[PDB]
């Protein structure tokens, strides 16, 4: 892929974060805390899952960013509609306004409904995410394996502004404490 030149600087929006998340001062890293992080509740916060949005909203153009997933057991990454549901239980699907992939229990899947098995020979330490708004495309790349394609959502119906989407995952196992990090351009 030659999408690197559409690189955008993503920062995390504290106001959308689950109340257990800890975002770094530079707003480029997020991890699950061991308790409530002493913030007030608001209608933006994801209540049921350790999720947060990027501050940036995209309604046109081509955008690229990279996320570090080193030593994590579980995570979700991608984009979502600005108007996705925040409270209660929901599935990650395009019908619900999400275009995502995840790791959980030693397998990688795309967030279609129902979900799709991914075929990854080299476990990624960094993921590239490419959005072509006009084309209706969201693609995921394995930076660790020379930028190899993971998955393409095509014929996407975004139906609104898009926001970068993150889930650091739970840490029931004690093996998933590591952060998600937005990698430098
Ligand atoms: C002013 C505000 N508007 N909505 C708020 N909520 C507090 C958290 C639960 C949902 C209701 S704060």
From Swiss-Prot:
PTM summary: Autoubiquitinated; does not lead to its proteasomal degradation. Deubiquitinated by USP4; leading to its stabilization. Autoubiquitinated.
Compartment annotation: Cytoplasm; Cytoplasmic vesicle, Autophagosome; Nucleus; Cytoplasm, P-body
Domain B30.2/SPRY: 8-185
Induction of synthesis: Up-regulated by IFN.
Quaternary structure and partners: Homotrimer. Component of a SCF(SKP2)-like complex containing CUL1, SKP1, TRIM21 and SKP2. Interacts with CALR, CUL1, FBXW11, HSPA5, IKBKB, IRF3, SKP1 and VCP. Interacts with SKP2; the interaction with SKP2 does not depend on an intact F-box domain. Interacts (via N-terminus and C-terminus) with DCP2 (via N-terminus and C-terminus). Interacts (via C-terminus) with IRF8 (via C-terminus). Interacts with ULK1, BECN1 and with ATG8 family members, including GABARAP, GABARAPL1, GABARAPL2 and MAP1LC3C/LC3C. Interacts with TRIM21 and SQSTM1/sequestosome 1. Interacts with IRF3.
UniProt similarity note: Belongs to the TRIM/RBCC family.
Domain remark from Swiss-Prot or TrEMBL: The coiled-coil is necessary for the cytoplasmic localization. The RING-type zinc finger is necessary for ubiquitination and for the IRF3-driven interferon beta promoter activity. Interacts with SKP2 and CUL1 in a RING finger-independent manner. The RING-type zinc finger is necessary for ubiquitination of NMI.
Function (record text): E3 ubiquitin-protein ligase whose activity is dependent on E2 enzymes, UBE2D1, UBE2D2, UBE2E1 and UBE2E2. Forms a ubiquitin ligase complex in cooperation with the E2 UBE2D2 that is used not only for the ubiquitination of USP4 and IKBKB but also for its self-ubiquitination. Component of cullin-RING-based SCF (SKP1-CUL1-F-box protein) E3 ubiquitin-protein ligase complexes such as SCF(SKP2)-like complexes. A TRIM21-containing SCF(SKP2)-like complex is shown to mediate ubiquitination of CDKN1B ('Thr-187' phosphorylated-form), thereby promoting its degradation by the proteasome.
Name this polypeptide is given: E3 ubiquitin-protein ligase TRIM21
Lineage: Eukaryota, Metazoa, Chordata, Craniata, Vertebrata
